[PDB]
Design a protein around this ligand. Structure first.
Ligand SMILES: [Zn+2]
Ligand SMILES: [Zn+2]
Ligand SMILES: [Zn+2]
Length: 232
């Protein structure tokens, strides 16, 4: 029942209930003559919502807020971007204009600034060293080390056992490495091991793009990263 680029007109967003008070958001974007899906997370925080990641652009992100307003009807008070690339911070101004507090690590804020990308307002302290975790309302934020990017974070919902891996985790259908221009291929498998060791109990694993699964998405990503590393 999980939405694919099949069920999603570009410019629109669908929500998907993963567990009680946890949803993913799914959007699509054209890039380089192909159409890709993109996932983020929505976590109920009492009577408000914490959003993880934009819906990859201003137009998509305005559709996301409208769709949250339609389908959940609770206010989005805070948002966290999991790394500095446009599919995660693109739309941060839309969030800001709607009165959402936008957050990212100083590492992410620095890299977005260098990249000329949108910059989340608020800074997340205590994530600068591999293996650091901090509590952020109904989730834990975890910096596993460099992987897809040097600043990538992952997000865990303790109450529902949902691990959101963002773009550091690939879906099973992904069989070759994506865009790795900003990746640390040498450290990626070690970073995934930190994730494995810290959340052995996760029941659902949501990748940055594509279908959810279980913890074998971690091993899958390792397999793919290692194959790419060994490319001839
Ligand atoms: Zn990225
Ligand atoms: Zn603020
Ligand atoms: Zn991504």
């Amino acid at each position: 029942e999980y939405p694919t680029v099949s069920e999603i007109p570009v410019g629109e967003v669908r929500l998907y209930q993963i567990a009680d008070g946890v949803w993913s958001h799914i959007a699509t974007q054209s890039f380089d003559g192909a159409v890709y899906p993109s996932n983020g997370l929505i976590v109920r925080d009492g009577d408000e919502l914490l959003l993880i990641d934009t819906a990859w652009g201003a137009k998509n992100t305005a559709a996301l807020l409208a769709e949250i307003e339609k389908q959940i009807g609770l206010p989005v008070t805070r948002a966290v971007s999991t790394h500095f690339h446009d599919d995660r911070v693109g739309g941060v101004d839309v969030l800001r204009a709607a009165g959402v507090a936008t957050y990212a690590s100083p590492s992410t804020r620095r890299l977005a600034e260098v990249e000329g990308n949108e910059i989340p307002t608020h800074s997340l302290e205590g994530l600068s060293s591999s293996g650091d975790a901090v509590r952020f309302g109904p989730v834990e934020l975890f910096y596993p080390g460099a992987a897809h990017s040097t600043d990538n974070l992952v997000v865990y919902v303790p109450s529902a056992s949902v691990l959101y891996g963002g773009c550091a985790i690939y879906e099973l259908s992904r069989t070759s490495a994506g865009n790795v221009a900003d990746a640390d291929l040498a450290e990626w498998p070690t970073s995934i091991e930190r994730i494995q060791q810290h959340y052995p109990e996760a029941q659902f694993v949501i990748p940055g793009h594509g279908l959810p699964g279980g913890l074998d998405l971690l091993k899958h990503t390792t397999n793919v990263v290692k194959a790419h590393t060994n490319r001839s």
